């Protein structure tokens, strides 16, 4: 069985090791939770989870700074999903939202 699921929304949990890894996946068409094999998960969705990232909706950007690395620009983003703001890389934040920051000046 070689195929990839076309209705994968996000990966919730991981319980496997190596190439034989399993993901807890929420669907885009039925909203049910069941375990699947990582082989049947698209590389883009799987990459983001392994990078320790997660998907959310952003309210607005409230803060801006230079990262600890001193190279990359970071933004402080207010999240709809939760009450606390976090610092995320410029690439990780919605492109239209950061344009809203310029009006604040």
């Amino acid at each position: 069985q070689v195929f990839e699921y076309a209705e994968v929304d996000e990966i919730v949990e991981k319980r496997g090791k190596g190439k034989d890894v399993e993901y807890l996946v929420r669907w885009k068409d039925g909203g049910d939770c069941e375990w699947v094999k990582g082989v049947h998960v698209a590389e883009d969705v799987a990459k983001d989870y392994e990078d320790g990232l997660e998907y959310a909706v952003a309210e607005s950007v409230i803060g801006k700074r230079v990262g600890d690395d001193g190279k990359t620009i970071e933004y402080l983003v207010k999240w709809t999903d939760m009450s606390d703001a976090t610092w995320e890389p410029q690439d990780n934040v919605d492109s239209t939202l950061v344009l809203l920051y310029q009006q604040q000046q």
Binding site: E54, V57, N92
Partner: peptide, 8 residues
Amino acid sequence: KRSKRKRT
């Protein structure tokens, strides 16, 4: 749309 964020 959706934005990504570290595992918090």
